[PDB]
């Protein structure tokens, strides 16, 4: 057993690090992936603020997935106070939600491809570079994200930190022209995401057929069960979500308990293995002390007393019984979600009545009852819980998808060459600002 | 000429500032192709440590009780010719003004300051989210300021001046800016621009004059920024057609 | 490309009026602002435009995103109090889904638009979707309570009876629907001006694509400046299409000489005001947005 | 020795600052008897114009569109050795930050600034209402600073120093002071003093840390003032028993 | 009138404990803070006192204006997280109608009281109605989530089972009602301290009328400093009345030598912290409330 | 007309006097008028203040509730309240909708007294015009608000 540490991680959102115990062959025996993002404390600063403000602050948790926190937070206030929003507000929120899933998955394509090979070769994708095919692939991705962000701004008021959601519905319905325009963009987008989906699935299939990859000069063997774990999965919807206002909620708050990293992470250790050649700047100097129990910046939520995986594979396993697991399975599941996003948008536009009401006639002020809302954010189940009384937030809690994935990914690190530990991590599409909030 | 060297430093931010930049689409790829190298950005590239930079786009604010974070921002000033506070968290604190600690697993992570409170800042790009157009414009103008003829470095230096004046004015942003420095000053003309730019619908105009929902406002500084009676540099803004043509040229294929 | 220091940069200046008779029925002057936006809509240069529509009190303007010929005509006539036109500039590109936004307003509102195009501060998507600006001349504006006091106390008229208002030839003019006319000396009205108009150094809407106003042309006719390439393409096409009667400004009385004189008084008066803010206090002064 | 000459100048205020002074009861009559002449105060005496003053207690803020008002406050600096911003309207604007015009019969009366924005101010007495004790203490200490032995003018000059430092810090007061300059600075210790001093119950403590109702706050600056982590001059405050005895002595019959 | 530079200005210092046996049943140490306020109430030196009463979560303190012997005893025992004692300082003189207010708290809370007495900023009537302060020694404090993490994860105890907590002899001590004991090394707890305690330069509550703490005296006994004339009149009267067992501090172990050493480490450590704020940045530093 | 900073409220189209004489004339038919009458009426209000306080304390239940169980947020309806302030009738009018003030108006006692005192100035030596004014106990900050 030796101790190697990668810090910081790269090609993910936010600031984390990997603290790995390895055997004499350099395979992980027990690795801890933990956040080291400073804790802004959204849930604690929320207390005493108005129910209108708290969702706009929580949105600023993360700029890749602001839709998820705006919606989960707003609908937790609606659930605590017993507010039923109009049908045309729900339709605009679903359009906003699906558009944002398209842009997030596409962004993640940018972050993972540098680890993938142009199929049948030993050249890795470089997207920066003004060469083919990398450059025409970047162009497709850029137009997908652009369509996605435009639809989001139209139905949501803003692509990053949507302004249109409010307690009781939306500020604005959209004009007949706006609806035509979102339809036109989603028609163009459906063709593109099918192309991109097929492209990415082929690249992943080629990776599943490799025996090694190249990391800073060396060949690194590619294990067959790369990134396997036994934690299972948790998901609340294939697309949108669920709240405590529902006749049959698809999440059970009685099965949840958040603990401290204390119960699941490693205690103090000292780094006795180092590699200055790891691209690009090497690992932690030998002799450095590390304590994942105390350096980890997140809490550990559990379901039936155990950490779980959330995200696109969690969703397909829960709702279609998708039966592959691990790193490449996670990549596959995520790409398969591309078309649903655009079919949803088009179905929703078709039912939207641009003359319809978007604000509930009555907004109650709340009596201190607990409500919750789950949003199936691009990376997994995003659950906000709230007690609102007299229009003020008296209690608030956020169980964010990457928070769920931290201890579960850590366990998935067993059996991997420490040089591709980051590849196991990237399959989760991590957002460390989200996880920490 | 050489491309300038640009880095993306991420403090206590949400990565939405980075996303905004990327939402320049092919304009960003044109910039990266012809005018700038991204020497650092943990989100997009594997460079683990802060190299030297001609321009550093710093997003987020600084948590005073995270040692590594105070070090990163000092290191960034040391390693960079131009420091840009990118976005309202970096310029003015924004939602991290509201942080006060007590959350797992670092209840002591309590205090957050905009970067200009710890280091000297040359340029502000205010907004939450910041507009892609502004980030692009500021990046092109930084390149002219460094690799252009004297006619461009003069243009570029006049364009950037109000964004540099904002960095010297202070580190505080709020709806009350419009009271203190506009209405209270005899300067408000009731155009309504502040209402359009506010990202949380905190501003209405009542009888032609601003009305702020101060418990909705997230303290981003956008409204004083966009107000045409905060800064109005007639030498740049009256040449709008020309400066627009130049900018479009610099990105044409 | 002339460059008057009191009339701004422009290509040409003619005296014009719309050939659309229905539009001229309630236009303030020559119907230039209405006719340019209607034509811009029908031709496809814009898909919508911010205008000063009817509001909730009489003679209170209310900004609105118009997207039909009919909605545009609803904004004819001058309203002498503030209409925060730019409050809908960003929303026009969001919920309304516009690609090619028009904007109408007075000079300070054109400046806001140009500032947003070059320094968008939380104004994403606005720079590239502003497609056409039409700016009115403006000597000064009033608050609603000011306009109430002028019309009801000084002119002694009921606002519900007023069909038209006009500042011209040193007097505030009120016209009633039943046919009477009342005036107020402009000396009486000076306490009622919005204080922020006293630092404004722009009279003929220098930063607009096209500019239009009353002074310099006979009643029923507008003084028009064409300024930007956008202004030129649209104005050429519209004259070609028959949308306008023109007359060179030189062969029209009072013409460009009167206009330059009133512009000059505005800038010099306000420039003095800007200068005194600097020493307004003792060892202290007031902010200058222009420094 | 001579009594010092004191005037009460009333700008755009509510006269509650004057009332507070009068609520010193017999202490005010003791002061007026033995240490000060009131050379000016429109509310209590018939002196129509601003005479020369050793200390000027200026209450209220300045409406920039009332000519006589801009003149009075300039005249006050010219005629006075020490200028005191008495109360939060004079120090920080307070409720006149919210003024925006449009009311009969002067719809143009629109813009209001605290006095320090037009003239130089030597001492701040913040509060809305300001505490009678503070106004008394500041008046007695001003007399020692001018007619006492060197041991008193030294005491008095150290006491007044934080009130002079406030006048140089700025002209803005708000609940957000406690965020910017205390919580965000690592300085908050959760004593709860800010909650006690807030006059509109805008402040609660949640888990030991301040929570501000920013749409209740009237922008008076009282909470940063009273906070024991804004200024804490150990040389004065640790001598509390002694300085209290001195002050009581100066008013004893 | 000694003047230690680490123990503040005081007249005398003895080691004491209350003779009221019922009060000693749950006092943290010698029962000095409880016994002084009870006695002050019964004698008439105060008509009410702010104390750290029971709150709404277990081991969360809640400030309250106590006005009976019974309410005062409810505040026995040390709570290791923040209790914003001063939030009720002004209200005590309003709705409660008190003339002679008592205050209890740690060192920073005594400083707030003294600051309010000399610089009342919207604190009318407070200076002359503060009548008696009793200050506890305090090395540092914690937030509730910190105290939760220490007790439940590190000590592995249930908060609903804890009868007493004690920091002493380098360990965090938890005592359960059923009889168990658990400890935590103080090195583990250092991440959990409230950051604002790191600039505090006061250990034995220098600015109180009377000060009291644990260090320097055996278990069940308090180290007490009498400081002000008010502190002296009340403490004399109470010993005369039989309220206290005393013992000179010199003839008690560890006694005043240990105390001065821990005080010295606090000030020097925190003073360093105060010094580094000055150069925390590059060409910039952090505020110093003491400058 | 142009320097006056207040509006002129009227009752049945005419300015009126408000304050302690207004109260005693309305409720007890107090039948003296003018400067010295106003001073007299004001002093006669001293004892009622203390008898009221004592009666109120006697009925006060210090354990009783002080906050209504439900606070509605308003639908835009107009309400008004009159307070008999030391100088006269203080009437605030409001429309509240969704917890926000949509319309507000204040008719303050010295505002009422300004045009009425002005008319009372006829027949006085201009050197004691101020004495006529002081009988109204003027508050010009109130009147202007
Ligand atoms: C305060 C104000 C002051 C003016 N001062 C002068 C002057 O000093 N000298 C001069 O020659 N002309 C002045 N004008 C312009 C002139 O009165 C006519 O309005 C102008 O010529 C347009 O006439 P038209 O026939 O082409 O427009 P119409 O066809 O009648 O259309 C009216 C246009 O005016 C806009 N508009 C109307 N009221 C407002 C308002 N409060 N704010 C913003 N936009 C509004 C509408 O959007 C619309 O496009 C002023 C206008 C305003 C609002
Ligand atoms: C964070 C904290 C840290 C301390 N650190 C030390 C130390 O390092 N060395 C040392 O010798 N003593 C320390 N003490 C004091 C010591 O623990 C005893 O509380 C003190 O001696 C009083 O004991 P007693 O028997 O006289 O009081 P009791 O009769 O038991 O009465 C308890 C008193 O404590 C007050 N109180 C209890 N908890 C709090 C709280 N969070 N905030 C404010 N007031 C409170 C109550 O108002 C009450 O008057 C500390 C106390 C606290 C709250
Ligand atoms: N998807 C996503 Fe976020 Ni940037 C995470 N984790 C959250 O809800
Ligand atoms: N009495 C009284 Fe005030 Ni200072 C007046 N007028 C108001 O309500
Ligand atoms: S300014 Fe807004 S978008 Fe940028 S890091 Fe801060 S929260 Fe995100
Ligand atoms: S943008 Fe500026 S000038 Fe225009 S309405 Fe707002 S504060 Fe007034
Ligand atoms: S009012 Fe809106 S735009 Fe201005 S600082 Fe607050 S959040 Fe930003
Ligand atoms: S005078 Fe100038 S600032 Fe005032 S309304 Fe006219 S264009 Fe606007
Ligand atoms: S500070 Fe408060 S009491 Fe003093 S004049 Fe201003 S409103 Fe009145
Ligand atoms: S008074 Fe100061 S130190 Fe005490 S709780 Fe309030 S901001 Fe924190
Ligand atoms: S919170 Fe209360 S004490 Fe602080 S500035 Fe606002 S009104 Fe004053
Ligand atoms: S260490 Fe000092 S500042 Fe922190 S609680 Fe103890 S007395 Fe207060
Ligand atoms: S400082 Fe604006 S609440
Ligand atoms: Fe959480
Ligand atoms: Fe009124
Ligand atoms: Xe990105
Ligand atoms: Xe990107
Ligand atoms: Xe870049
Ligand atoms: Xe970048
Ligand atoms: Xe710069
Ligand atoms: Xe860029
Ligand atoms: Xe730059
Ligand atoms: Xe007074
Ligand atoms: Xe008085
Ligand atoms: Xe005085
Ligand atoms: Xe006075
Ligand atoms: Xe002074
Ligand atoms: Xe005084
Ligand atoms: Xe003074």
mmCIF file of C-alpha atoms and ligand atoms in Angstrom, chain A residues 64 107 110-111 145, chain B residues 15 18-22 41 43-44, ligand 16:
data_model
loop_
_atom_site.group_PDB
_atom_site.id
_atom_site.type_symbol
_atom_site.label_atom_id
_atom_site.label_comp_id
_atom_site.label_asym_id
_atom_site.label_seq_id
_atom_site.Cartn_x
_atom_site.Cartn_y
_atom_site.Cartn_z
ATOM 1 C CA UNK A 64 -24.101 24.862 -15.676
ATOM 2 C CA UNK A 107 -20.812 20.537 -22.564
ATOM 3 C CA UNK A 110 -16.337 18.543 -24.575
ATOM 4 C CA UNK A 111 -14.882 17.531 -21.209
ATOM 5 C CA UNK A 145 -25.477 24.197 -26.959
ATOM 6 C CA UNK B 15 -18.782 28.309 -13.424
ATOM 7 C CA UNK B 18 -17.003 30.413 -17.784
ATOM 8 C CA UNK B 19 -20.214 29.160 -19.448
ATOM 9 C CA UNK B 20 -21.017 32.688 -20.598
ATOM 10 C CA UNK B 21 -17.626 32.891 -22.311
ATOM 11 C CA UNK B 22 -18.224 29.572 -24.061
ATOM 12 C CA UNK B 41 -8.566 26.451 -16.972
ATOM 13 C CA UNK B 43 -12.603 22.939 -16.320
ATOM 14 C CA UNK B 44 -11.272 22.499 -19.884
HETATM 15 XE XE1 LIG G 16 -17.475 25.638 -20.266
#
